[PDB]
Design a protein around this motif. Structure first.
Motif, PDB file in Angstrom:
ATOM      1  N   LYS A   1       0.830  -1.508  -0.145  1.00 49.11           N
ATOM      2  CA  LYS A   1      -0.366   0.091  -0.018  1.00 49.11           C
ATOM      3  C   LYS A   1       1.158   0.955   0.068  1.00 49.11           C
ATOM      4  O   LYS A   1       1.653   0.817   0.967  1.00 49.11           O
ATOM      5  CB  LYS A   1      -0.768   0.243   1.117  1.00 49.11           C
ATOM      6  CG  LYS A   1      -1.419   0.854   1.337  1.00 49.11           C
ATOM      7  CD  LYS A   1      -2.983   1.072   2.885  1.00 49.11           C
ATOM      8  CE  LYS A   1      -3.681   2.585   3.149  1.00 49.11           C
ATOM      9  NZ  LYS A   1      -4.194   2.049   4.186  1.00 49.11           N
ATOM     10  N   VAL A   2       0.299   2.161  -0.952  1.00 52.90           N
ATOM     11  CA  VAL A   2       0.907   3.639  -1.211  1.00 52.90           C
ATOM     12  C   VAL A   2       0.150   4.483  -0.197  1.00 52.90           C
ATOM     13  O   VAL A   2      -0.489   4.362  -0.732  1.00 52.90           O
ATOM     14  CB  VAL A   2       1.637   4.224  -2.605  1.00 52.90           C
ATOM     15  CG1 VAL A   2       2.124   5.803  -2.221  1.00 52.90           C
ATOM     16  CG2 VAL A   2       2.530   2.831  -2.887  1.00 52.90           C
ATOM     17  N   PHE A   3       0.630   4.909   0.891  1.00 52.72           N
ATOM     18  CA  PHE A   3       0.156   5.831   1.982  1.00 52.72           C
ATOM     19  C   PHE A   3      -0.265   7.361   1.102  1.00 52.72           C
ATOM     20  O   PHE A   3       0.753   7.536   0.781  1.00 52.72           O
ATOM     21  CB  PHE A   3      -0.088   5.800   3.253  1.00 52.72           C
ATOM     22  CG  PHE A   3      -0.037   4.368   4.352  1.00 52.72           C
ATOM     23  CD1 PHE A   3       0.345   3.508   4.064  1.00 52.72           C
ATOM     24  CD2 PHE A   3      -1.231   5.086   5.544  1.00 52.72           C
ATOM     25  CE1 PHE A   3       0.108   2.449   4.757  1.00 52.72           C
ATOM     26  CE2 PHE A   3      -1.772   4.008   5.840  1.00 52.72           C
ATOM     27  CZ  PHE A   3      -1.616   2.911   5.958  1.00 52.72           C
ATOM     28  N   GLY A   4      -1.330   8.055   1.509  1.00 47.09           N
ATOM     29  CA  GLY A   4      -1.035   9.438   1.265  1.00 47.09           C
ATOM     30  C   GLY A   4       0.020  10.573   2.855  1.00 47.09           C
ATOM     31  O   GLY A   4      -0.690   9.185   3.365  1.00 47.09           O
ATOM     32  N   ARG A   5       0.136  11.259   2.616  1.00 44.81           N
ATOM     33  CA  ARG A   5       0.978  12.410   3.261  1.00 44.81           C
ATOM     34  C   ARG A   5      -0.134  11.670   5.319  1.00 44.81           C
ATOM     35  O   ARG A   5       0.493  11.972   5.848  1.00 44.81           O
ATOM     36  CB  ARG A   5       1.328  13.352   3.027  1.00 44.81           C
ATOM     37  CG  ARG A   5       1.821  14.247   4.256  1.00 44.81           C
ATOM     38  CD  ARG A   5       2.457  15.346   3.225  1.00 44.81           C
ATOM     39  NE  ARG A   5       1.272  16.455   3.358  1.00 44.81           N
ATOM     40  CZ  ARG A   5       0.124  16.968   4.013  1.00 44.81           C
ATOM     41  NH1 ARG A   5       0.537  16.852   5.516  1.00 44.81           N
ATOM     42  NH2 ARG A   5      -0.517  17.875   2.950  1.00 44.81           N
ATOM     43  N   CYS A   6      -1.588  12.700   4.514  1.00 42.63           N
ATOM     44  CA  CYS A   6      -1.679  12.711   5.821  1.00 42.63           C
ATOM     45  C   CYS A   6      -2.673  10.937   6.708  1.00 42.63           C
ATOM     46  O   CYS A   6      -3.133  11.535   7.269  1.00 42.63           O
ATOM     47  CB  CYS A   6      -3.417  13.788   5.480  1.00 42.63           C
ATOM     48  SG  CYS A   6      -2.405  15.116   5.840  1.00 42.63           S
ATOM     49  N   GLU A   7      -2.775  10.566   5.033  1.00 41.13           N
ATOM     50  CA  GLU A   7      -3.290   9.161   5.566  1.00 41.13           C
ATOM     51  C   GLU A   7      -2.281   8.406   6.529  1.00 41.13           C
ATOM     52  O   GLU A   7      -2.728   7.308   7.623  1.00 41.13           O
ATOM     53  CB  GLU A   7      -3.392   8.636   4.074  1.00 41.13           C
ATOM     54  CG  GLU A   7      -3.900   6.873   4.775  1.00 41.13           C
ATOM     55  CD  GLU A   7      -4.437   6.277   3.424  1.00 41.13           C
ATOM     56  OE1 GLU A   7      -3.408   6.029   2.396  1.00 41.13           O
ATOM     57  OE2 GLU A   7      -4.539   5.233   3.449  1.00 41.13           O
ATOM     58  N   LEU A   8      -0.830   8.613   6.597  1.00 46.45           N
ATOM     59  CA  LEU A   8      -0.431   7.775   7.404  1.00 46.45           C
ATOM     60  C   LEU A   8      -0.251   9.052   8.610  1.00 46.45           C
ATOM     61  O   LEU A   8      -0.010   7.441   9.616  1.00 46.45           O
ATOM     62  CB  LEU A   8       1.425   8.208   6.617  1.00 46.45           C
ATOM     63  CG  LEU A   8       2.332   7.250   6.708  1.00 46.45           C
ATOM     64  CD1 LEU A   8       2.216   5.860   7.624  1.00 46.45           C
ATOM     65  CD2 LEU A   8       3.945   7.114   6.142  1.00 46.45           C
ATOM     66  N   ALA A   9      -0.128   9.707   9.040  1.00 44.11           N
ATOM     67  CA  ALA A   9      -0.271  10.787   9.607  1.00 44.11           C
ATOM     68  C   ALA A   9      -1.183  10.115  10.895  1.00 44.11           C
ATOM     69  O   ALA A   9      -0.847   9.590  11.512  1.00 44.11           O
ATOM     70  CB  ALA A   9      -0.313  12.043   9.581  1.00 44.11           C
ATOM     71  N   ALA A  10      -1.949  10.023  10.277  1.00 45.50           N
ATOM     72  CA  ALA A  10      -3.452   9.793  10.948  1.00 45.50           C
ATOM     73  C   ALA A  10      -3.172   8.370  11.737  1.00 45.50           C
ATOM     74  O   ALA A  10      -3.429   7.874  12.806  1.00 45.50           O
ATOM     75  CB  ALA A  10      -4.485   9.771  10.507  1.00 45.50           C
ATOM     76  N   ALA A  11      -2.921   7.233  10.823  1.00 41.63           N
ATOM     77  CA  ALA A  11      -2.597   6.043  11.111  1.00 41.63           C
ATOM     78  C   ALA A  11      -1.413   5.818  12.569  1.00 41.63           C
ATOM     79  O   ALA A  11      -1.314   5.528  12.817  1.00 41.63           O
ATOM     80  CB  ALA A  11      -2.058   4.848   9.395  1.00 41.63           C
ATOM     81  N   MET A  12       0.120   6.699  12.099  1.00 44.08           N
ATOM     82  CA  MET A  12       1.189   6.229  12.263  1.00 44.08           C
ATOM     83  C   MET A  12       0.889   7.292  13.837  1.00 44.08           C
ATOM     84  O   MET A  12       1.236   6.436  15.410  1.00 44.08           O
ATOM     85  CB  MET A  12       1.812   7.585  12.303  1.00 44.08           C
ATOM     86  CG  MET A  12       2.743   7.202  11.087  1.00 44.08           C
ATOM     87  SD  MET A  12       4.224   7.813  10.347  1.00 44.08           S
ATOM     88  CE  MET A  12       5.671   6.415  10.463  1.00 44.08           C
ATOM     89  N   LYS A  13      -0.824   7.968  14.638  1.00 43.03           N
ATOM     90  CA  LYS A  13      -0.830   8.837  15.196  1.00 43.03           C
ATOM     91  C   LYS A  13      -1.720   7.884  16.201  1.00 43.03           C
ATOM     92  O   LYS A  13      -1.756   7.337  17.062  1.00 43.03           O
ATOM     93  CB  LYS A  13      -1.947  10.488  15.099  1.00 43.03           C
ATOM     94  CG  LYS A  13      -1.957  10.408  16.253  1.00 43.03           C
ATOM     95  CD  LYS A  13      -3.646  12.415  16.237  1.00 43.03           C
ATOM     96  CE  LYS A  13      -3.519  12.726  17.247  1.00 43.03           C
ATOM     97  NZ  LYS A  13      -3.400  13.737  17.139  1.00 43.03           N
ATOM     98  N   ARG A  14      -2.774   6.947  15.470  1.00 45.65           N
ATOM     99  CA  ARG A  14      -3.925   6.022  15.650  1.00 45.65           C
ATOM    100  C   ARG A  14      -2.942   4.830  16.717  1.00 45.65           C
ATOM    101  O   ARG A  14      -3.223   4.100  17.760  1.00 45.65           O
ATOM    102  CB  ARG A  14      -4.141   5.711  14.360  1.00 45.65           C
ATOM    103  CG  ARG A  14      -6.235   4.963  15.239  1.00 45.65           C
ATOM    104  CD  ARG A  14      -6.169   3.640  14.152  1.00 45.65           C
ATOM    105  NE  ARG A  14      -6.728   2.105  15.466  1.00 45.65           N
ATOM    106  CZ  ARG A  14      -6.327   1.040  14.774  1.00 45.65           C
ATOM    107  NH1 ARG A  14      -5.678   1.048  13.469  1.00 45.65           N
ATOM    108  NH2 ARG A  14      -6.726  -0.150  15.476  1.00 45.65           N
TER     109      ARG A  14
END
Ligand SMILES: [Cl-]
Ligand SMILES: [Cl-]
Ligand SMILES: [Cl-]
Ligand SMILES: [Cl-]
Ligand SMILES: [Cl-]
Ligand SMILES: [Cl-]
Ligand SMILES: [Cl-]
Ligand SMILES: [Cl-]
Ligand code: NA
Length: 129
Positions: A1-14
């Protein structure tokens, strides 16, 4: 999977990476950007024969088992293949161990050379978090 920038930010935070060992979310997004371009399937061979795996390019020399890195350890107790999943849980759990090992995010050479000291908050700019 290639994350979007904000999408990844959100997953890392979660997954509790945000301010983990005092490293703001922007640091982790910046590191992932330059390690893998946000691609969970990224793999790169090292000159020493080890391999780096996944969004944060975790090295088989210490952290995961790939069965072809003579003399290495598996300090995360995982197959390196687990680090290529679309779900980032294994990568995050293993990165928490790495960043706790004594040298903080300097373990990631790309973080040191391209993120450290820079305006890393730009990486989470505009993200709904
Ligand atoms: Cl980007
Ligand atoms: Cl930040
Ligand atoms: Cl091995
Ligand atoms: Cl091989
Ligand atoms: Cl080990
Ligand atoms: Cl294994
Ligand atoms: Cl995930
Ligand atoms: Cl530190
Ligand atoms: Na290994």
């Amino acid at each position: 999977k290639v994350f979007g920038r904000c999408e990844l930010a959100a997953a890392m935070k979660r997954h509790g990476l945000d301010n983990y060992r005092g490293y703001s979310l922007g640091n982790w997004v910046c590191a992932a950007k330059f390690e893998s371009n946000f691609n969970t399937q990224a793999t790169n061979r090292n000159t020493d024969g080890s391999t780096d795996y996944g969004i944060l390019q975790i090295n088989s020399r210490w952290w995961c088992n790939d069965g072809r890195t003579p003399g290495s350890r598996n300090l995360c107790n995982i197959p390196c293949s687990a680090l290529l999943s679309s779900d980032i849980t294994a990568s995050v759990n293993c990165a928490k161990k790495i960043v706790s090992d004594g040298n903080g995010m300097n373990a990631w050479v790309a973080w040191r050379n391209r993120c450290k000291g820079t305006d890393v908050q730009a990486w989470i700019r505009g993200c709904r978090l």
